[PDB]
Structure 1
Amino acid sequence: GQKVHPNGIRLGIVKPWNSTWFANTKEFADNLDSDFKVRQYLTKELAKASVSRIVIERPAKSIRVTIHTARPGIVIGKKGEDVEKLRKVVADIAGVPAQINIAEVRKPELDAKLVADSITSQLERRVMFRRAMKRAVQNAMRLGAKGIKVEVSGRLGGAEIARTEWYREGRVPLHTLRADIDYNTSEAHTTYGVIGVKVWIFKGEI
């Protein structure tokens, strides 16, 4: 039937949070909305920058945004111009002084978000779904992932009846809480509808 979100079920055990700050009931909603606006802006500008995830931390009267990307060069820009411009807008949205830092996600094949984004981009460019899924699985296994599961659902190939396909290699234990299961989703807006892509990556336990 329905499956629990691997990140949510492992939030306190073997996973970190994407937002780490303490706030009372008065400013809890305001901080959440500001973080949502900051993430929406950064994702839109850095969509071509291969940003795996964004971590927003709020020190005393400050906001430190760490952007994990597989292409640090484009995000940083020449002489830090791009990150400085991003820092200005993030500070404007948050209302408190901002500090944007860039982290490098080495081995981009072993990242659920990057694989899902790549598959959706290929599907939008009318690349065969089976070819994209097999290549993604083969790359992850070659790089050293202990297991990967890729699921693509929707009107595959323009068929009037939607279907769900999935390829799994290695071990992908979703019932082991001490498993470092990296899970992420993405959607591709094709000419026939919306196609959803889910990626599970198992990189070992503990």
Structure 2
Amino acid sequence: GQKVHPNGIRLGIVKPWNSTWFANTKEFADNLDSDFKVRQYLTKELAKASVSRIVIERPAKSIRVTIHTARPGIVIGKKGEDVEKLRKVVADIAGVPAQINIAEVRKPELDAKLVADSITSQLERRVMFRRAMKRAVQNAMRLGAKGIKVEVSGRLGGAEIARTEWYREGRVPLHTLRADIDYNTSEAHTTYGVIGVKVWIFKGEI
């Protein structure tokens, strides 16, 4: 087990943080756990909506949750009853007056959360993994994407030993720190157990 998380080593360099509140030591743990609850809830209740990121920020006793998603229409719905329902329950969880926004992730096959969730969904619909991976690399390289690597792992095809079998195309410069590597990871709970899907997407060199 030996590679650094390629989001974490780029946190001040190119990648931003998904939480951008300041807090002293008295409420740092409380704000942090409140963020675990709103991302847990808001991740479970938008499983069909293809959600990429949820960014929390707290401007002066009020949360401001931004849902980067690929299907904004299914998040908002017929006149946005679903949004006001979500800020009602996020205001229930965080205990502050909640705002909520939706940012449309166009080009959803270049986002690693959406790619890993895609391949994970296909693996738990019992399709063969080489199609899922290989299709994901092809259609991601089709639109921009100066590199992509996907990597499934663990008891693939229902075996009794676990393999990995990664694929990559293009250039994925993972030790370069100015590389805009969009990396994310999902787990596929199949009837044989968990299958881990990692995906790195190299977008640009700065």
Shorter-chain TM-score: what band?
over 0.9
How far apart are 1:60 and its partner, in Å? 0.4
How far apart are 1:143 and its partner, in Å? 1.1
Distance 1:69 1:104 in 2: 5
Distance 2:142 2:29 in 1: 44
**Deviation string for 1:38-74 (max 9, x for gaps)?**
0000001001000001000101011000000000000
How far apart are 1:83 and its partner, in Å? 0.3
Which position in structure 2 is the counterpart of 1:105? Answer: 105
- SS of 2:68's equivalent? strand
- SS of 1:33's equivalent? helix
TM-score by length of 2: 0.99
How far apart are 1:11 and its partner, in Å? 0.5
Which position in structure 2 is the counterpart of 1:54? Answer: 54
How far apart are 1:77 and its partner, in Å? 1.3
**Deviation string for 1:19-45 (max 9, x for gaps)?**
000111000000000000000000010
Distance 1:189 1:28 in 2: 33
**Deviation string for 1:107-144 (max 9, x for gaps)?**
00100000000000000011110010000000001011
Distance 2:181 2:188 in 1: 23
- SS of 1:187's equivalent? strand
Distance 2:53 2:88 in 1: 20
Q: CA RMSD in A?
A: 0.6
How far apart are 1:93 and its partner, in Å? 0.4
Which position in structure 2 is the counterpart of 1:124? Answer: 124
- SS of 1:162's equivalent? coil
How far apart are 1:152 and its partner, in Å? 0.4
Distance 1:61 1:197 in 2: 37
Which position in structure 2 is the counterpart of 1:79? Answer: 79
Distance 1:61 1:114 in 2: 32
How far apart are 1:101 and its partner, in Å? 0.3
Identity %: 100
**Deviation string for 1:153-180 (max 9, x for gaps)?**
0101111000011001000000100000
Distance 2:168 2:160 in 1: 26
Distance 1:35 1:106 in 2: 25
- SS of 1:49's equivalent? coil
Distance 1:121 1:80 in 2: 27
How far apart are 1:97 and its partner, in Å? 0.3
Aligned residue pairs total 206
Q: Which structure shows the higher strand fraction?
A: 1
- SS of 2:31's equivalent? helix
Q: Which structure shows the higher helix fraction?
A: 1
How far apart are 1:79 and its partner, in Å? 1.2
- SS of 2:157's equivalent? helix
How far apart are 1:17 and its partner, in Å? 0.4
- SS of 1:150's equivalent? strand
TM-score by length of 1: 0.99
User: Which consecutive residues of structure 1, in runs of 5 or more, have no partner in the other structure?
Assistant: none
